Each structure stands twice: as C-alpha cells, then as structure tokens.
Amino acid sequence: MLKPNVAIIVAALKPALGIGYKGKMPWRLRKEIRYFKDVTTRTTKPNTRNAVIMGRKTWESIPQKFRPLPDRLNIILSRSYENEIIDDNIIHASSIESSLNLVSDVERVFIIGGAEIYNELINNSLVSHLLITEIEHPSPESIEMDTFLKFPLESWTKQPKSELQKFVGDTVLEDDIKEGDFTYNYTLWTRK
Ligand SMILES: NC(=O)C1=CN([C@@H]2O[C@H](COP(=O)(O)OP(=O)(O)OC[C@H]3O[C@@H](n4cnc5c(N)ncnc54)[C@H](OP(=O)(O)O)[C@@H]3O)[C@@H](O)[C@H]2O)C=CC1
Ligand SMILES: Cc1ccc(Sc2cccc3nc(N)nc(N)c23)cc1
C-alpha cells in the first residue's frame, strides 16, 4: 500500500504524559480498553480490515494465547527482523514503510506502542493523526511511572469533538469518564 495516512493511538496521564511503569500500564480503565478495541477494529469499506503496528517488546508483553490481536492485521517491528509475511494476520518488518509495502485491502493504520515506537514514529511524516486519551487524577505524582511521551505538541492542533466523532464514525464517545480516581476524555490532534 503506498503512503497511507497513519494514526498513533495512546492513553496518557496528564500533566507529564506518563504511559507506563516497569513494562505495564499504571492503570486499568475498562471502558478505555473497549474504546481502543472498537476504534482499531471497525471499518467502513467492505472486504477491508485495519492494521495495528507495535514494537517487539509490546508484542512480547501480550500473553501468547492472546496474540495476534483479533480482527486486525498485526505488524511487529524489530531492527532484527526481515520483511516477511508470517500468516494472513502477522507481518514482521524492520521499518514502518517497508511493512506497508506488504499490505493490501487495509483501511486505516494505527501505531499502538510502546514508548520507543511512539517517540521515534511521531517524527515520521506518514503520521497524520493522534488519538490521545487524556487521563486526569487528583494526585498524579502518587502514580509511579518511568515512561513518558516526548511529543512535539506545539506542532499539532487539538480538534473539536465533532472532528473526533467523524473520525470514529459510530463509536459512542462519552465525556469525562470516571473509573476509580481517574477521569478521562478522548481527543484527536492533526498537524499544523
Ligand atoms: N499508555 C499506553 O497507551 C501504552 C503504553 N505502552 C507502554 O510502553 C512501554 C513499553 O515500551 P518499550 O519498552 O519502549 O517497547 P516497544 O513496544 O516500544 O518495543 C521497543 C522495541 O521495538 C523495536 N523498535 C523500536 N523502535 C524501532 C524502530 N524505530 N524501528 C524498528 N524497530 C523498532 C526494537 O525491537 P528490537 O529491539 O528487537 O530491535 C525495540 O527494542 C510499557 O510501559 C507499556 O505499558 C505500550 C502501549 C500503549
Ligand atoms: C501488552 C499491550 C499493551 C498495550 C497495548 S495497546 C493499548 C492497550 C490497552 C489500551 C490502550 N488504549 C489506547 N488508547 N491506546 C493503546 N495503544 C492501548 C497492547 C498490548
């Protein structure tokens, strides 16, 4: 597939934009996971699917029985991999662009993590949209975190919820979702 628009999808804790701790997410937000699954899976065209791209360490973090993520083409990057189609659901590649050359009948492409992937791919011009779930907590400093987004947000524009709605189509978008002490909202950002 030639030069598709790519989107990054991540959940981060404000104000620092922390996303992890010792290889895991520092929260369990059940509704947020459901939103991730829906946005990443749904398509509008007929015989198409979406593709999700992740770094080797994230792939490895999914229990073997639960990979590949169902109903989406999974792409796994590692600097040690050859560009290769494993099966109809799994591709190995050493670069985002090389992976995309092996795909057909894909509607949208999403980068799902982790931190190294995010922090490196944010500067790739193929990335056109960011879906950030912005998480808030009364005492963000009490949450232990070792991993953060280093995104140049001064070069991006947060769109109105109308644009996000249009992006996700049918998916229901609630406002100020609360789970335990966390409060969160979904946002869409595009480049200036
Ligand atoms: N909050 C959220 O929404 C999410 C958070 N996360 C969090 O992120 C953390 C994991 O991140 P991290 O450890 O950095 O792991 P990644 O999933 O980012 O894996 C990094 C690995 O990917 C490969 N890789 C990295 N960059 C490139 C590149 N530019 N080209 C090709 N291959 C590349 C390398 O494979 P090799 O070394 O084999 O070359 C590298 O070791 C955890 O804390 C996790 O919870 C993950 C997803 C979502
Ligand atoms: C192990 C593993 C860790 C993270 C992921 S990606 C992911 C998982 C759960 C919720 C997620 N929410 C958003 N908004 N973005 C992601 N990229 C998510 C996939 C596998």
Side-chain angles (χ1 to χ4, degrees), residues 1-21 23-44 46-104 106-192:
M1 189 147 311
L2 176 66
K3 304 290 191 174
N5 295 323
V6 176
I8 278 168
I9 179 165
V10 59
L13 183 62
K14 293 208 292 166
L17 304 176
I19 64 167
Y21 183 78
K24 55 68 182 256
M25 296 171 71
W27 50 75
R28 180 182 68 289
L29 310 176
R30 279 171 292 161
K31 289 169 91 160
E32 212 284 328
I33 312 299
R34 212 170 273 96
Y35 165 80
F36 167 86
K37 165 186 58 52
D38 283 351
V39 171
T40 72
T41 306
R42 65 154 272 166
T43 57
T44 65
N47 292 245
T48 74
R49 52 188 170 167
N50 287 337
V52 293
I53 298 174
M54 71 193 100
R56 179 188 59 70
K57 287 173 177 51
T58 293
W59 175 253
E60 286 178 7
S61 283
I62 301 170
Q64 80 172 58
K65 326 85 216 174
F66 309 129
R67 64 197 203 223
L69 299 179
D71 300 321
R72 284 154 285 187
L73 170 64
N74 296 217
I75 292 162
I76 303 85
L77 311 177
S78 166
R79 291 187 204 82
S80 300
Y81 298 162
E82 287 311 314
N83 297 324
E84 176 190 348
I85 291 160
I86 301 214
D87 66 22
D88 209 52
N89 300 315
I90 303 173
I91 288 173
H92 272 198
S94 55
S95 77
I96 187 168
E97 207 167 346
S98 300
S99 73
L100 300 169
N101 287 331
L102 294 330
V103 316
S104 59
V106 161
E107 186 177 289
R108 282 178 158 168
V109 195
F110 293 94
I111 294 166
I112 72 168
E116 189 173 343
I117 289 287
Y118 284 146
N119 288 335
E120 211 103 289
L121 308 167
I122 187 52
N123 302 306
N124 187 309
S125 59
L126 292 176
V127 178
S128 55
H129 295 80
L130 309 180
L131 294 164
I132 299 162
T133 297
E134 299 192 325
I135 306 159
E136 312 169 83
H137 180 285
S139 175
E141 53 286 333
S142 62
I143 300 148
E144 310 317 325
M145 215 138 57
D146 65 14
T147 301
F148 306 87
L149 299 180
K150 65 177 203 210
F151 293 179
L153 301 172
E154 33 318 76
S155 284
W156 290 84
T157 302
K158 182 197 277 192
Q159 293 293 138
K161 197 186 184 183
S162 49
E163 293 293 313
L164 176 53
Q165 194 64 71
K166 288 151 64 183
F167 190 99
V168 303
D170 294 316
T171 305
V172 167
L173 305 173
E174 278 180 301
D175 303 304
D176 303 322
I177 306 164
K178 305 177 178 61
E179 291 186 56
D181 290 309
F182 300 103
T183 302
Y184 58 93
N185 292 93
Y186 307 122
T187 71
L188 177 64
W189 298 71
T190 54
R191 298 192 181 269
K192 24 199 80 150

